[PDB]
């Protein structure tokens, strides 16, 4: 039984840079027993490097592993936006053991979000509930503030947000804020708006619609 | 004259576990007292018989099996065990009567560059019978398409190398194992303590 | 053409039992090391069990006595029978060939299935459109009030993939999940291109196709 | 390692009855299974060796059987001196000799109601700094008795430690004493100190309490 | 056939202790000898074994490289050297003659055993606290803050036998032991009959008598 530890927890590097992921062990472990796995969001882990240094079939040349004894290193040279994933080391003593994993975030230029507002469907309104959805599309960094204003009154405690992972192609985030009201409450008001403040925006952007129009 | 246990224990080179050696010991007087107090052993477990009782017992034949395995695999050399070594390399019966003796051999069987002479059988369709030896090197077929003697996808060489290095942890270090089997037939015994 | 296809996941009450399947093509399950690896939400990977080609089975201490791994040679399928399930067993379960040892690594892996252990009940989703308004336009689907996870949303049965964003499910205060799937399209193709989102809630066999069209004022 | 499992952990039988103890092994130990008897405070004594062989001097009422993984010790006619703890010990792994959990043979009697008494901490104890509240359950059967501490009607657990006397040689009854240990600063903070008792020979939980002072 | 042990006692952690066990009435120079311990309130645990001539010695994995077994055939005695003792070693140690009727080990004769308690706690004394009643009554004494085991408690110097109940001790969070002992007496003879509990702590050589009155 040998305990492996990966470092760092998260890594943030721009595209084209060299990534260095470590997997240190308390005792000395044979290099032939060390392996690396890549897991992209929403997918199954994929064998990346086995035997500490041997590259798996179909794995790009920019992935390479090295090290021996107590310090095994995975290197991702010429980093790409599609390399956004969590990487685990793995070894065997008396049972298969994985490391805690290392997240690889990908830096990119500031991107202002494209804002879209969506009224509730009449189909949902017949059910007795109104869901108003505000979309922040393809921005960076993740820090963004979304404010709901119903008839120019700031709303609080009736909206939930959801953020996507970093995009595997442009390395941006997307956010959806859903305002939820009852049908009776939804008809009581006319103007529905979400205001967006982001680093890529010189001034807050507001998207709105008038109920019935 | 005395039984040649020294030829097995003090052997300068050991066999791989998949091709484990066996010495048949017959027609001699066994001196178990001096044998068990010679070297220092990391593992000494006997089954169905006591180490101090062997001096008073007689047997038709005595077998001395010897091989090399990993440190973390010594627990598989025992009755009723399972694992890559016990299933595919060296298997002991559930009613095994004998002793298992192992000691760390990092100073003898490990090289700074890695000692890749000790192999074990990794792939096998079925488990071994007790005391069954399989020295086959036929390409293992893990898929529907046959291999025809060429290693490829789903076509694996059955043996895997250990690769011992002196600075590895004790779980990964080489251990030399001697298994003493005591056969008792309805025949005149030739080995007594 | 080597695939490991998994099934059997979903909702199960605390203390109940479940049986996952791993149908293989491209390799013989009875001839390989076959393992199960689970991953709790937001957490790392954990090896669960393995079965040798010779028949021996082994389990992690966190599941010993409750899980039983098996196989069916005629169906070429790996199985994992899970009993006495609790919250600590809620995870995505993967099957894989190998055991993570030299010359015997985890390869290939299955797509994984999600086991949710809760006292709640399975509820099918409702799908509502997110209609565009009057350079580039954005439309989407709102999948609301389903349990448990997951739901999968595609657009035009896979023909529309660029610009699609499906957000993680948020647990509403009512105990039911809700997510939105949006996609950005050029404004010119709103009247000359039909957009249909394809919502699949596996735990309830609920497959809903929603056409998203602009609304006429 | 070979684990020996005995069942049951305890039994209640009267003089003359037939007692059979079971002892299971995690793997086949052939026939090398020994039985021992240990009196309270005395050393163990050998009863049956090699599953079924009777040791010299051991009474004829003792007999063993079994092979492989299941083994049985049988007392054909129980006697008043045969009330002790009985261990099974495998000898197949001669250099890893393991014992069983033990099976205590106890005297069977009628269900007796416990006499509950509560005691406040003495004045010589408050002078030192500590304060122990002792509650007594006197002469009852069976052993299974629940003792609950309520300080100001608040359930207490972890502040006390129980202790049970062995089965009495006259009326075969047990006794329980729970010592609610607490500091002096925790004693004058409250007022009510109760002792709730739940037993098989009680139609309703009996509580003996007192007020501080 | 008899076996007599000695050498047990109190020992601080890391120190050493040597136990002895003398045999009689059998060919001691041809039988194997064992050592078996049992923690207070726990089961039995095989410890070590030595051959008939003393050349072969085999230990359990819990005391290996830490205990040592030896014997002297010309004197028919057996020993057990216990070095670097931990708190878990606290148990009653028995020596056992090996029955020679099988190919395997089995203990056909044991010794009475000697208690070995391991800790650095000082040998303190008891603090007797009367348990006054508030349909008979009950009164008792408390044996608190002492180390190690055991303590002997009696009433009226052994004159009050019926109705007495002495309970086991419990190792409280500090490390010392706390023991309770009570006796139920009729409520009529409370001011006429005298009750005095006799607490004796042999490890600390302390004997305390205390009066118990309402
Ligand atoms: C091996 O050689 C040593 C001396 O180097 C000797 O003491 C020992 O008895 C030998 N082993 C056997 C089994 O004879």
Residue numbers in the entry:
A (entry chain B), D (entry chain L): 1 to 213
B (entry chain E): 334 to 526
C (entry chain A): 1 to 134, 140 to 222
E (entry chain H): 2 to 135, 142 to 221
The authors write:
S is a large type-1 transmembrane glycoprotein that assembles into homo-trimers (Walls et al., 2020), which decorate the outer surface of coronaviruses. S1 is responsible for target cell engagement, while S2 completes membrane fusion, allowing the viral RNA access to the host cell cytoplasm, where viral replication can begin. S1 contains an N-terminal domain (NTD) and receptor-binding domain (RBD). The RBD interacts with the cellular receptor angiotensin converting enzyme 2 (ACE2), which is expressed on diverse cell types, including cells in the upper and lower respiratory tracts, allowing SARS-CoV-2 to cause respiratory infection.
We also study neutralization by a panel of potent mAbs that block RBD-ACE2 interaction and provide a crystallographic solution of how one potent antibody, mAb 222, of the panel (Dejnirattisai et al., 2021) which contacts both K417 and N501, is resistant to the 501Y and 417T/N mutations found in the P.1/B1.351 strains. We measured the affinity of 222 for both P.1 (KD = 1.92 ± 0.01 nM) and Wuhan RBD (KD = 1.36 ± 0.08 nM) and found no appreciable reduction in the strength of interaction despite the changes occurring in the putative binding site for P.1. To understand how 222 is still able to neutralize P.1, we solved the crystal structures of six ternary complexes of 222 Fab with the RBDs for (1) the original virus and bearing mutations: (2) K417N; (3) K417T; (4) N501Y; the 417, 484, and 501 changes characteristic of B.1.351 (5) and P.1 (6). All crystals also contained a further Fab, EY6A, as a crystallization chaperone (Zhou et al., 2020) and were isomorphous, and the resolution of the structures ranged from 1.95 to 2.67 Å (STAR Methods). In the original virus, residue 417 makes a weak salt-bridge interaction with heavy-chain CDR3 residue E99. Mutation to either asparagine or threonine abolishes this, and there is little direct interaction, although there are weak (∼3.5 Å) contacts to heavy-chain Y52 and light-chain Y92. However, with RBDs bearing K417N/T mutations, a buffer molecule/ion (most likely a sulfate in some cases and a glycerol in others) moves to form bridging interactions, which may mitigate the loss of the salt bridge. Residue 501 makes contact with CDR-L1 of mAb 222; however, the interaction with P30 is probably slightly strengthened by the N501Y mutation, which provides a stacking interaction with the proline, conferring resilience. However, for 150 P.1 neutralization is less compromised than for B.1.351 (Zhou et al., 2021), while for 222, neutralization is completely unaffected by the changes in P.1 and indeed all variants.
